[PDB]
Design an enzyme around this catalytic site. Structure first.
Site, PDB file in Angstrom:
ATOM      1  CG  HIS A  95      -2.080   0.980   1.112  1.00  0.00           C
ATOM      2  ND1 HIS A  95      -3.333   0.695   1.602  1.00  0.00           N
ATOM      3  CD2 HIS A  95      -2.145   2.249   0.644  1.00  0.00           C
ATOM      4  CE1 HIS A  95      -4.126   1.737   1.438  1.00  0.00           C
ATOM      5  NE2 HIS A  95      -3.433   2.697   0.857  1.00  0.00           N
ATOM      6  CG  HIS A 114      -1.402   6.060  -2.288  1.00  0.00           C
ATOM      7  ND1 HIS A 114      -2.026   4.959  -2.837  1.00  0.00           N
ATOM      8  CD2 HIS A 114      -1.942   6.225  -1.057  1.00  0.00           C
ATOM      9  CE1 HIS A 114      -2.933   4.504  -1.989  1.00  0.00           C
ATOM     10  NE2 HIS A 114      -2.899   5.251  -0.902  1.00  0.00           N
ATOM     11  CG  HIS A 162      -6.495   2.565   5.708  1.00  0.00           C
ATOM     12  ND1 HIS A 162      -7.175   3.054   4.616  1.00  0.00           N
ATOM     13  CD2 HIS A 162      -5.293   3.204   5.722  1.00  0.00           C
ATOM     14  CE1 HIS A 162      -6.423   3.945   3.993  1.00  0.00           C
ATOM     15  NE2 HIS A 162      -5.278   4.056   4.644  1.00  0.00           N
ATOM     16  NE  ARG A 205       0.965  11.687  -3.996  1.00  0.00           N
ATOM     17  CZ  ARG A 205       1.668  12.722  -3.550  1.00  0.00           C
ATOM     18  NH1 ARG A 205       1.070  13.885  -3.314  1.00  0.00           N
ATOM     19  NH2 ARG A 205       2.971  12.589  -3.331  1.00  0.00           N
ATOM     20  CD  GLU A 240      -0.850   7.088   2.726  1.00  0.00           C
ATOM     21  OE1 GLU A 240      -1.308   7.813   3.658  1.00  0.00           O
ATOM     22  OE2 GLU A 240      -0.193   7.570   1.768  1.00  0.00           O
ATOM     23  CG  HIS A 252      -7.556   3.407  -1.154  1.00  0.00           C
ATOM     24  ND1 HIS A 252      -7.970   4.638  -0.690  1.00  0.00           N
ATOM     25  CD2 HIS A 252      -6.314   3.214  -0.647  1.00  0.00           C
ATOM     26  CE1 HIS A 252      -7.014   5.165   0.065  1.00  0.00           C
ATOM     27  NE2 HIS A 252      -6.000   4.324   0.098  1.00  0.00           N
TER      28      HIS A 252
HETATM   29 ZN   LIG Z   1      -4.041   4.693   0.630  1.00  0.00          ZN
END
Ligand SMILES: [Zn+2]
Ligand SMILES: [Cl-]
Ligand SMILES: [Cl-]
Ligand SMILES: [Zn+2]
Ligand SMILES: [Zn+2]
Ligand SMILES: [Zn+2]
Ligand SMILES: [Zn+2]
Ligand SMILES: [Zn+2]
Lengths: 332, 332, 334, 334, 332, 332
Positions: free
Chosen positions: B6, B8, B223, B72, B282, B179
């Protein structure tokens, strides 16, 4: 003793039929009211309903000595029209709760609904608050989404729209118990919506100046804070870039323990501390099912907390009775 | 080996400027494209920005060997008009990611955005999916709320609206990575909205027949599953009257570990097991802040997992590389 | 014999509580169903509750031998969302009426609600119609305003949107009984909305080709036709340049006698004739208040009709008995 | 003498063309005004046009001595935009009615339209009321539905939104004549909408405190009260637990006799009494078709009333003459 | 001779009152129709109205031999409801125009309105087109904004929504005469809206493939093309970046000369050439006012064109008669 | 000396990226700001981009000595939500313009955007106007359509909604420069929308009492007044019944010469006179294309004006410098 800060009224069926009639005639018959005898009100507390046993019998079985009972939130129709039926129904539910707690004072303590109508100034709940105070009510359910997952939404809880209520709650020294009501979404039904709304409400309160402006405001967030204790890290991190830490506002909040897994209860209590946790179970309700692997009812969660070895007896007494006694101003 | 599932893309500024221009002329200038060189793209992956160091440098500091980078999400504007700019911008982001992965292949593996336009049939993302497959993409971000917290919402993930997509994903044997994108709400900004949408998406998948109909579908929930591992008890309870338990469907799902507290990481792993967790951080992002109680970056979470004594070395290898190699079809 | 063609079910409180819960969880708990015993269904037909006495006792006091009972229309929430709760509730009400008529067959004859969801094609009520036919139902309440006085409205009754329903009613040879449901208006509460909607429905049927295309269609208009018999002159006048006169199509309609003044009953019967009037009272209900001038309830309207000198005893038998037997296909019972 | 309290202006075609142009340029050409001569205004009151004969000849044929003429309500476009064209058109119609009554004072008495714009406070009609008072107008058409059967509606007539108007009407001692205007509904065309709106307006006035707060307010309800005299029983029954009975407030209302069947006229007068009925016919208009049974127009309803044996000659003088003189403040003229 | 390609019918007042009645009863009386005698129709052509002289007398005074008369566009209420009144009124206006041209064939040539209802498929005008062809009509007013400056708008003229009409117009070899109708805007009243809509319509036609797909389509743009000939430079420039030049599509368009300043007439004719200009004046109408400095009526514009010294006699004959004769298929 | 009154800022890419980010997080990240150095800002004014040369180089090529630079209007997103991002972005653009003018003061004079939010009272732009005045700004772009061709529109410019702004502008003795921004229409893209909005704004100002009430108000209408000088005859005609003629109010207005055909430039100047024309080119922009019939850039229009023989040297000095010095209060 064990005080359960999160229960919902087991009412005579007449109450819910009164809602259906209000909605059907929209007030064209006038306010009227729920017509039920004291005997019917008592009977409703012993009736199984959709549960493994009656409301009173379940609390006895679980060792719960007293429970704070509030309206069933998913019935409170805060987005319904016309506005007057929202107010009337809320008033009738509260009156019924008052009667049941008067008839069964050994077990039930009254907590009120607010007649929040989506879009109305919050001052419109103050008259019913005052009636409830006079009746001995000990707190108020606060709905952060009276629009019930509609096309529109209310202001975040840090918005000055809500400040007159925080001022009144501090004047009364009575708590708000965060609890959403219904949901108009096909994606998020009401039992899931509860959790998302607790998450938003908690987030709003921990990223605004509410507790700077109302240092004594008492807020109990339902269901162990929605997602927040589990997701705390990311919100704390993002708050390091800002004025006050997320955790420093969160420290002001109380949380009930309506969580039905041991691991979740552990995380809640380890995150916010025994000083900010109030035992609650929602029994009878969503969790009143049997785990077929243990035979235990899922909302019989006191034993998990009693057996946690990282808590002292003093900590457990805080969670099981002292915090509720302070927060809901319960007198000996 | 540590694979971070994960991340971006750290993109040259020209990409976000292209977005602004597209929104400004709405296609009246033509699709055009991002005009940027390779030194500019590399520089982006090394530029400090608001973080304590560059994207590549942070991954080196943390011991991460490779990261799967996707758009993103909060920039992907799935609710924007006209629809063609949503498609064009998603395509240009996917192309830039491809360039950056080619330019810096010791570090970055490509994961695609889907050009989801609020209200469009999901089949409208297939052409781009095919293009990305041809370019070696290993997964797709799936947004359960292309309406971006607007007045309307999409159907729940169990709805047949989405079945064409699950079909394609099984044909490709490639995963969807849940997401959300932006949020139009003043109450729920996008960083909070992510979590609530993960909760809803997971709830929908675990209370529908998706995995009955697509037993091989691979879904990774961001998450740590939103609220779900923390709130699992109440949703399991409600499912005991249903074709399958909530937990039985949840057992098909994968979860990434983008959680920045030790307790949340432990609860996730104890709840779903090492066999269903994929290391993710992240980094760089909302977690790239210094916890001055330690000096460590909040999103440097690999050490927490490395030091859990309830996990075997084999369990840790699952979390850190093997699950991602299997789910995202990574070749040695 | 006296057959009252316009009564609404006296249901156990559990039925209305079920509605409240459906609306509250919006079907997220699944369809479920009303949980009531035969004993609870019977008790409800005798319970005093809001009226001076129980439903059956009043019909006995008034000399009514049998009554066709249909859903309480203002509870049927045809504009509610999601659509599935409208269908589910309608089905539960119909099931409960079947049970009550099965349990008390010397008093009650079943008439069904249609699960009209505002905006849905009318064919979506056909499955439930077939189920009610199998259960012995003898007619259907037809709501011309499933939008319940909202921002939008349904097509007029002459529109082809309704033609599939008229076809089916002719196939079954069973009547539609025009009846609106609730009203979202602050100006026009449901008891008034009933009347206005009866007027519109009747006007639509008398200014369209419905009866040209469905000559055997049976329609009973509630409450003596809303405004129409009183306002007939103005509509007849404007119809003189049309295919058929307003009165020529109106001659096909039946009308129930739920009117609580003697002068209105007289005007209804003189206007449409005893061959098209079906005795109905809505007892217990809106008219269940004592008339000071008679010491009897206002919905005790049978004696007004029995005492009209301008009707023959045969005319009165049509109004009290024979018309309902023909229109609702009532076989020799009791 | 026979005074017809319910007639609408027969205007030169230029008036309606003016409306079309206002709507077309939306006031961008300014207010302008109708350009018609006295000769054109007079000719219009004699022109045959859509009716069997001219307006004045029909009143002569029917023995009507004078008629109170008001705007043609279905042209008054109370829901139209921009608001200024509603005001301007209403003012031009009122000016033209004043001129026609000035030119033909032995036949026509002026009754005014109100420039009701849907959504505007009622005080916005006061300036035009004052102008009409100065011009000798004797009453005002009051529209309970300036939204013209749209997605929205006005407050009920009992709402304080209307109280400023009732106050002014009492100050002037002049009546409101309840009359709806057009209708945007495909189900309910304007001639039917009239009736339903009269029913709602009457119901509102009889279930609110208006007459408690304005005991001298004069209200005439068009078309014999819509549905109310026919449906009175059900509304009376439900009022028994209120401040006053429905009938007790209804006793304050006046009703015109624009009903084109003998049975309805009989029911109206027996229900509210000759002390509250004002002869009205709407001739020429909806009723201006030959009744085959009489060889006369359906709006030639005077002979029905004259032949009712249950009324005294004094009763008939109230209906034909005295009530209109009192309600519309008609002085000794002719 | 002088043929004026842009006039609007001087109708008996009964026509406009019929519109008001249709709108008042919304069809509840049925279609009915305009009841006027031939004598009333003739009288309307001699009546001053709001002008300095009657319609016939003005055309005589200005030396105009014949005029193509179409509906008064601002009355055609293309956004009105219900749809049937738009159709009925359009039909009645066209029938009235047919009668007047039959009664006064020495002066008036019929051009039809289309019963365009905002949101209806364009095929819904074809039946009235056919009736008008049978009546000898020579063209059709085409409204690019049947929504009449409302909240919504129709597709641009290059959209395939319009292609069935272009196909029919080519089959008939009859022209479309671009003319907007009313405007619901307080900012842009109808006389200004005409110009903006001509600008948009022309722009759409010169930036799409209409004239590639319909090379023989005949379009006359009212009022000298709105803003386009004056603003041509910027649109030509922007088209250099594209497929075909703006000017190359514009070359296919005809323009009428309804412009009341000499400088504007010069620019129009110098920009598009005498081969694409059709004399028109809108007399009587907006321009039927006197200039107090010259005493000339503003819509008496033939002398400006007669006196231009950069035009040959052949050019002037094109503008004054030959172009209209070809475009509107007028036979000797 | 040649002063070009109509140029738009050539900004570093970081500015447009800031816009994208603001829209993406909607303020949830804070206002922040554009982070860009001076070499980056200078480079922007010299970077070729899609034009044949850099902004500065083109002005040198064309003999322009100084240019008044304002925001790029189509980026200003006056209809975007939430309102605070419209304000913030406008403020950041004005700041960047200030920096660039300070960094390159031999060329660029600053003109400000106004933070107009669709639906907000115009007084909400005063704080920014004051800030820009303090920074030496010489004018303001005034958008008559902050709704950007949406379902709703603003009041016409004669409406008292705008009177507070005209008041402030007269107090400052600074001009408004009429310029629309974006367009949400598929029929009218923004480059066309500019022209239609100039037409409406000018029409509104010339048919209202604005200049009766603010005799000293200075307004410059972009692009030679939209359609108005070309369509003047018809609007003058309609005004002959009015307090003042259209031309009498139009005489108070100024017009820039952003027109790329010789004939349009001539018609503008002959219509309004040299005393009301300000040289402007929009270079670099939509006109920065090569007319291969000449090799000259379409927006190099100074030579056209220089070679008009109907203008005196004095008239040309008015157009090229004196009018701008007076209207924008430029100091020597
Ligand atoms: Zn994310
Ligand atoms: Cl009923
Ligand atoms: Cl009438
Ligand atoms: Zn709860
Ligand atoms: Zn009924
Ligand atoms: Zn009338
Ligand atoms: Zn024209
Ligand atoms: Zn510009």
């Amino acid at each position: 003793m064990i005080i359960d800060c999160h229960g919902h009224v087991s009412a005579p069926v007449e109450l819910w039929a009164y809602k259906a009639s209000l909605l059907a005639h929209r007030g064209s018959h006038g306010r009227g009211g729920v017509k039920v005898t004291d005997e019917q009100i008592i009977a409703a507390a012993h009736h199984k309903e959709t549960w493994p046993d009656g409301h009173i019998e379940l609390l006895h079985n679980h060792g719960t000595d007293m429970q704070l009972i509030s309206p069933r939130p998913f019935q409170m129709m805060n987005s319904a029209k016309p506005a007057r039926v929202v107010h009337w129904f809320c008033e009738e539910v509260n009156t019924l709760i008052h009667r049941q707690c008067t008839l069964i004072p050994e077990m039930f303590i009254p907590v009120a609904g607010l007649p929040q109508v989506a879009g109305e100034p919050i001052e419109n709940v103050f008259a019913e608050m005052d009636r409830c105070v006079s009746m001995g009510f000990k707190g108020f359910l606060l709905n952060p989404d009276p629009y019930e997952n509609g096309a529109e939404e209310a202001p975040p809880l840090g918005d000055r729209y809500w400040y007159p209520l925080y001022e009144k709650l501090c004047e009364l020294d009575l708590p708000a118990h965060i609890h959403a009501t219904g949901s108009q979404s096909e994606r998020s039904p009401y039992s899931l919506h509860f959790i998302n709304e607790e998450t938003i409400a908690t987030y709003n309160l921990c990223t605004s100046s509410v507790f700077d402006d109302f240092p004594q405001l008492k807020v109990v967030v339902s269901h162990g804070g929605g997602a927040i204790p589990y997701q705390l890290g990311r919100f704390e991190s993002q708050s390091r870039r800002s004025k006050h830490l997320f955790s420093e506002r969160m420290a002001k909040l109380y949380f009930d323990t309506v969580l039905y897994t041991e691991g979740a209860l552990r995380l809640l209590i380890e995150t916010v501390g025994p000083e900010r946790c109030l035992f609650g179970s929602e029994c009878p309700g969503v969790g009143s099912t049997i785990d077929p692997a243990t035979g235990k009812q899922m909302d019989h969660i006191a034993p998990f907390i009693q057996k946690f070895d990282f808590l002292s007896d003093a900590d457990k007494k805080l969670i099981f009775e002292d915090n509720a006694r302070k927060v809901f101003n319960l007198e000996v």
